[PDB]
Design a protein around this nucleic acid. Structure first.
Ligand code: K
Ligand code: K
Ligand code: K
Ligand code: MG
Ligand code: MG
Ligand code: MG
Ligand code: MG
Ligand code: MG
Ligand code: MG
Ligand code: MG
Ligand code: MG
Ligand code: MG
Ligand code: MG
Ligand code: MG
Lengths: 120, 291, 102, 25
RNA sequence: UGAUAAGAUAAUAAAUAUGUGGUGUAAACGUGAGUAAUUUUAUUAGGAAUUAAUGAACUAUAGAAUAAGCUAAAUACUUAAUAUAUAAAAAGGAUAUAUAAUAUAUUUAUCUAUAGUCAAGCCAAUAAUGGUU
RNA sequence: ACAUAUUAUUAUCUUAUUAUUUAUAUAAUAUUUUUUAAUAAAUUUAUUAAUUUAUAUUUAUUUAUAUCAGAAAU
């Protein structure tokens, strides 16, 4: 990632139980220093599904909280997301396939579920 | 001591001057700065003693390289080593890349074949380095009166001395030679005669594009007998004397042309008192063949 | 994933272990020139077979490259300058210019 | 000295003001 | 190519970071010596001088990228040319294709301008330990 | 009393370095400038080394001021 303003994960939580803040930060500041803004949170550990749920067809869910509007503003002013944040934003539908790379380009992989925007 | 040794020192001083760094040139060659040089104590490359003042260098005479060329031993790499060092200079040093004249290449090719006996490796250094001459804004050196004619002349002697008779190798080599000419200005017209003689000798019909027919225009040295003016004039026209004598001796068809014999009469009688250039060369080719 | 097919440059596992380099030719006996073993064994199996941390990760990276038609040529690990690392270069150079050129 | 000439210039200025205070008072 | 093999040229595949270059180390990390405040901290819906032809490095848009010298050579450095009172610049490389070194195309860099983003300088008001032996 | 250590100060002494400011050079380099040899090419021109000329940029020495520090005094 390049630039002075980057969107990246700052690590919180405890040893062996990482949680992350999605933050807009100056490139030169420490990973866990108070950033410019905290856009959201990322919990990397998927929620465990029960034996019955698994056969029932439930897929484990990773939970991300994100300010969609504020994130778009920072992309608009040229903030540069990290690779992991890029994957999150492409899955959220904020970023598109123009931000994909040659190593992760899923040009030929079947879609089992299409991105669905709902209200809850 | 010898003319060759003295010439080489002059030629090596000229190169060292022009290869010296521009910032350091005023302090190593202007004698008024000898004490400024000492104080600075610049260390000679190769971790040698600090550099010492040198005598100022003045423009070198083109005759200096002609003396060195004809001093090289009968079987030596000295001419081939000097040329490789001289033409390895940067193309930004104009003095080095403009000293070489069409006469020098003719005298480097005629000496190599008849005296030094390393013609093949002298025609490869010239063919290999022709591109650098073009980048160094000195293409004239590769002309038809000094480069092409001399080459075809040495071919008309090697093809005989060695008996080469292939009609494919000859044509391919002749085509390359013409392709290596950058200043195509046929004046004497001897080139067409030389090319035709090669074809008869090796049984092929020459055909080169741009070698338009030119009538003979041999320069006639006057009957007036001067000193250094006629010694230079003869040496000036020495190359075309080696080409006229060669043309007649190799093939008797060239005897038809009477212009060739007039020049022989004029050039030979001009200083018949001295030795013969053509004969002197022929002897050495035999003295080199025997080895 | 799936088993790629042997090529002409990389006919067998031994050729694969020689092209990647990094002293990976010393594992030719672990794989036994079995093409499928190279493309089925994951890190857990390689760790049980005595492959050290650095080599097994390197092999798995080159196995993924081969599976995706990407070059597997050896890329060398970085090395410090001849005159030493930046933090010790001034001292080293000073002691190397007083013992070589004086 | 330059520092001894600056000191005296300032000393005279301070003494003129101390006198000025007495003339004003 | 070189009439005998020393070299040159091009293509291909490797090597070199003990040669010249570029970028990176004003950060982060550690510590609490100094520092009682013309300087440091904290606070305010504070302020002007009414803060640079500063972009540091990304975003959007537009344009440009010229000639010599110096070094072995260059995206090194130097001097010039032309570009918002006007001032002030630059750089090529890789890969293809067509030509006879040049041109396009792709890709990655260089410079300038405008705005944004990030980020700077300065000032005020209020508060910040003990001793007047 | 005092012998010590530490720090600060200066109308004092010495002072690295640097900044600024003086004067000087038959100082160096580039260009200009006046001539002069040597050399080279061509049949005047170029180059190099000198001299004259101003200009810019440096260098050496030098004048003055400030300055790390040390000395002395307090
Ligand atoms: K610590
Ligand atoms: K402290
Ligand atoms: K380009
Ligand atoms: Mg990058
Ligand atoms: Mg290097
Ligand atoms: Mg710091
Ligand atoms: Mg250019
Ligand atoms: Mg250039
Ligand atoms: Mg540059
Ligand atoms: Mg400039
Ligand atoms: Mg301008
Ligand atoms: Mg008391
Ligand atoms: Mg002083
Ligand atoms: Mg002091």
């Amino acid at each position: 990632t390049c630039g002075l303003v980057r969107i990246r994960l700052a690590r919180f939580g405890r040893k062996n139980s990482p949680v992350y803040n999605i933050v807009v930060a100056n490139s030169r500041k420490a990973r866990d220093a108070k950033p410019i803004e905290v856009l959201g949170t990322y919990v990397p550990v998927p929620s465990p599904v029960t034996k019955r749920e698994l056969k029932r067809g439930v897929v484990p869910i990773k939970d991300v909280k994100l300010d969609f509007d504020r994130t778009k503003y920072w992309i608009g002013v040229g903030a540069q997301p990290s690779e992991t944040v890029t994957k999150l934003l492409r899955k959220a539908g904020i970023l598109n396939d123009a931000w994909a790379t040659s190593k992760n380009s899923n040009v030929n992989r079947k879609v089992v579920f299409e991105r669905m925007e709902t209200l809850e | 001591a010898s003319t060759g040794e003295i010439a080489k020192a002059k030629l090596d001083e000229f190169l060292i001057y022009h290869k010296t760094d521009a910032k350091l040139k005023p302090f190593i060659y202007r004698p008024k700065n000898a004490q400024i040089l000492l104080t600075k104590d610049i260390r000679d490359p190769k971790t040698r003693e600090p550099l010492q003042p040198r005598p100022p260098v003045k423009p070198l005479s083109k005759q200096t390289l002609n003396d060195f060329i004809y001093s090289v031993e009968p079987n030596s790499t000295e001419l081939l080593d000097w040329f490789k060092e001289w033409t390895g200079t940067s193309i930004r040093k104009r003095a080095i890349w403009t000293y070489i004249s069409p006469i020098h290449v003719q005298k480097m090719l005629t000496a190599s074949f008849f005296k030094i006996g390393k013609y093949a490796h002298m025609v490869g250094l010239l063919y290999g380095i022709e591109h650098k001459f073009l980048k160094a804004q000195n293409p004239s050196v590769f002309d038809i009166e000094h480069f092409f004619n001399t080459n075809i002349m040495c071919a008309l002697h090697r093809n005989r001395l060695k008996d080469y008779k292939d009609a494919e190798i000859a044509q391919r080599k002749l085509q390359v030679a013409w392709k290596k000419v950058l200043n195509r200005k046929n004046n004497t017209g001897l080139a067409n005669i030389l090319v035709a003689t090669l074809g008869r000798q090796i049984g092929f019909t020459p055909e080169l594009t741009g070698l338009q027919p030119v009538d003979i225009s041999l320069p006639d040295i006057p009957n007036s007998s001067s000193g250094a003016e006629l010694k230079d004039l003869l040496s000036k026209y020495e190359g075309i004397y080696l080409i006229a004598r060669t043309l007649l001796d190799i093939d008797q068809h060239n005897a038809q042309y009477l212009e060739l014999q007039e020049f022989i009469r004029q050039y030979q009688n001009a200083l018949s008192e001295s030795s013969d250039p053509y004969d002197t060369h022929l002897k050495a080719l035999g003295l080199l063949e025997t080895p | 994933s799936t088993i790629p097919k042997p090529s002409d440059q990389v006919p067998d596992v031994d050729a694969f272990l020689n092209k990647i380099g990094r002293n990976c030719n010393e594992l030719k006996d672990t794989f036994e020139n079995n093409w499928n073993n190279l493309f089925q064994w994951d890190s857990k199996i390689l760790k049980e077979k005595g492959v050290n941390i650095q080599q097994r990760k390197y092999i798995l990276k080159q196995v993924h490259n081969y599976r995706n038609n990407r070059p597997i040529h050896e890329i060398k690990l970085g090395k410090k300058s001849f005159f030493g690392g930046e933090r010790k270069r001034k001292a080293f150079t000073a002691k190397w210019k007083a013992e070589n050129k004086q | 000295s330059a520092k001894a000439v600056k000191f005296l210039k300032a000393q005279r200025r301070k003494q003129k003001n101390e006198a000025k205070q007495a003339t004003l008072k």
